[PDB]
């Protein structure tokens, strides 16, 4: 089991300065950070349909930097932006703004009360942050679990997931990085080296909630089959195949007007069969 | 004649056909039928595969219905259902009383919308007007195997629920028929959605309740397209109250697409998790309750 941290590009209220603030963390269970400043109860990760659809869409044409010889957030950011421009994911005029955004201060829960709280933020063409234009949706996880680290193994490696909204982008863009040597970065406070980096940038678009996109990416990284495939991935095709299997073994629950546990517990064999299908291909065995 | 006009995408007089009758509230019975071949005669026929009353029952390969279960969907089923519904062909308030009339009007609209070629129409009409057999006749037919329509592994639900009606159906209930088949001569998958002007007892397809809606899902073998799962997704869509209300009140394809997108907004995905099954399922109860808090208000 590994540690996955999700940070969202947000702006504070006391200075109106945009920075990175952690929104959720995974050590095989998901925890979320509330507006009060404390972590909610741990819970199993549940994903929206649109988050997984968009994650697949941005992954299929995603920019992958496997076995990258970088040991700094600045170096990873520079290499990722160069490969973004190389693959026509972004434009060369966007590089300066995206580099300024990626290297911003990464804040954590211990300084949320030191600030005046954080607000959703969109990175604008200039050096100033704007406010989102689309209607806001308060996170389901924060409403359900928040309104109320010793399990990290000593020989584990971390994953950092960065989600940000920048209106000066034609399309959402996914950047996946696997470092050659797991290194500790200034972004992550916990003394665990980072092996993987997820970077999700894009403009405001319908059916795309970047917090849920980062939740889907972090849940994918927290899955053992995909993580083992990600360590062994030599190309974007293998990661895509692992994502396809992850979606193959997913279970979609439609809305209903009369939910009951007796009907829901009838899906126990389906969940068991999907888990068995997921683990039949991996070297690992279900825990 | 010499002229071969192209379809004109115009809805300038669409509101001239929007009825002023407020639709009534009906509970739904959904039946999924699949295009199959029987070993006794090698005859193509439509066979009942699953039905929806309150839960889902699937028909096993013994002619007996399986355990009732909650309707789970695959991710690919909903993705491809949205894809084919975006380009879907709709016939809303269709004044037909036979399956032949519905099929002919649907194929005419298919050709008008360039969904199928004019050389596909006769074979599709033959397929849609085949015999619709039901579970009682399965023993007399000596089994049934899936078939693919030509121009000339077992399913998860059966594996997990089938290996081992009129009392339940509410009185003022109308039927939804979902027809699913594979046609190797089609270029792309096509969706047909039909809401009849009034419910009808089609002599071609006898059902416990009159048919109001028809789902037609045909297409070739394409990746990530399981037509049985696509039919199950359409049936679960019709079984849900909000989409059913919108489908009764829909006047264009856009309203149906908006309802389907809201349905997907309120859909929750459980990833493959290593947790025990009962805890993994029961973790979905408060999340789904908070997600559906405003949908049914």
UniProtKB/Swiss-Prot annotation, chain A:
Portion of the full sequence shown: 56 to 355 of 911
PTM field: N-glycosylated.
Record function comment: Functions both as a transporter that mediates electroneutral anion exchange across the cell membrane and as a structural protein. Component of the ankyrin-1 complex of the erythrocyte membrane; required for normal flexibility and stability of the erythrocyte membrane and for normal erythrocyte shape via the interactions of its cytoplasmic domain with cytoskeletal proteins, glycolytic enzymes, and hemoglobin. Functions as a transporter that mediates the 1:1 exchange of inorganic anions across the erythrocyte membrane. (Microbial infection) Acts as a receptor for P.falciparum (isolate 3D7) MSP9 and thus, facilitates merozoite invasion of erythrocytes. Acts as a receptor for P.falciparum (isolate 3D7) MSP1 and thus, facilitates merozoite invasion of erythrocytes.
Recorded consequence of changing residue 1 to E: In Di(a)/Memphis-II antigen
Record: disease: Ovalocytosis, Southeast Asian: An autosomal dominant hematologic disorder characterized by ovalocytic erythrocytes that are rigid and exhibit reduced expression of many erythrocyte antigens. Clinical manifestations include mild hemolysis, intermittent jaundice and gallstones. However, the disorder is most often asymptomatic. Spherocytosis 4: An autosomal dominant form of spherocytosis, a group of hematologic disorders characterized by the presence of numerous abnormally shaped erythrocytes which are generally spheroidal. Affected individuals have anemia, jaundice, and splenomegaly. Clinical severity is variable. Some individuals are asymptomatic, whereas others have severe hemolytic anemia requiring erythrocyte transfusion.
Region (Globular) residue spans: 1-222
Identification of the protein by name: Band 3 anion transport protein
Tissues expressed in: Detected in erythrocytes (at protein level).
Similarity remark: Belongs to the anion exchanger (TC 2.A.31) family.
